[PDB]
Amino acid sequence: KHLKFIARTVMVQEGNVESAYRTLNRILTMDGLIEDIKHRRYYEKPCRRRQRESYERCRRIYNMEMARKINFLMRKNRADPWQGC
Amino acid sequence: WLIKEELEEMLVEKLSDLDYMQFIRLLEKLLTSQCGAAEEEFVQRFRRSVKQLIEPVQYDEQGMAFSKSEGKRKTAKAEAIVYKHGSGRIKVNGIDYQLYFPITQDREQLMFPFHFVDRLGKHDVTCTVSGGGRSAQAGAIRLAMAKALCSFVTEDEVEWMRQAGLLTTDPRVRERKKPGQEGARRKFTWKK
Known about the structure:
This is part of a larger assembly, with chains A (85 residues) and B (192 residues).
Chain A: H1 17-31, H2 33-40, H3 46-74
Chain B: H1 4-11, H2 17-32, H3 37-44, E1 58-59, E2 65-73, E3 76-83, E4 90-92, E5 95-96, H4 97-100, H5 104-116, E6 125-130, H6 134-149, H7 155-164
Parallel strand pairs in B: 4-6
Antiparallel strand pairs in B: 1-2, 2-3, 3-6, 4-5
Helix pairs in contact in B: 5-6
């Protein structure tokens, strides 16, 4: 009941359908539609869905904190100043 | 750089490879730092210092010039006398090469050095070979003739011959059969 060719529509620039399709796939992946379809193919029982959401949230927390630590310590990757000691 | 064993001997102290590597890296930094003479001589305490030989030309009874050499291949051993002038005639055991080596492969092996140095027909040769088979004898004669020819060809040609491999004694020899196996490496058929 919506106007067609407005949603999830990408105009290919200069005929590079490869780039256009990659950009569209990026858009859908960022919006999470690809994961939504993949999971919705088969029914995810509510307990399993809750467990997966909890696991994903814990993984997100851990990965974000690890990335923060990696970036924070990146500056210390410099060459050793006190070589010889 | 003195090896870890030399460094241990100098320091009368046991060391680990990591400690030695750290010390060597520090020494490398010191040397790269554009140091003075005192530092360079100090480093010399730790620094450690790390072509074909040509036979001499001789003269025959008529005084005509020649060179002599020897070589070995497999069980074959050959000694070659290469004269300074000739028509490319090679006499092995007093027999012309075309009759001593019916195999074109062995004749090519004989040809190889002269063809390499662009001297086909520019010398005569007398070679005496023993042991090994036809191919081993051909290789030994090739090596001896090349070593003798080094006495005549220029140093650039000698180095080029070495780089082509005409002056390296082929160490590849037969490998002894080991007990419990068919040959040098062929183990018996694993039974099941």
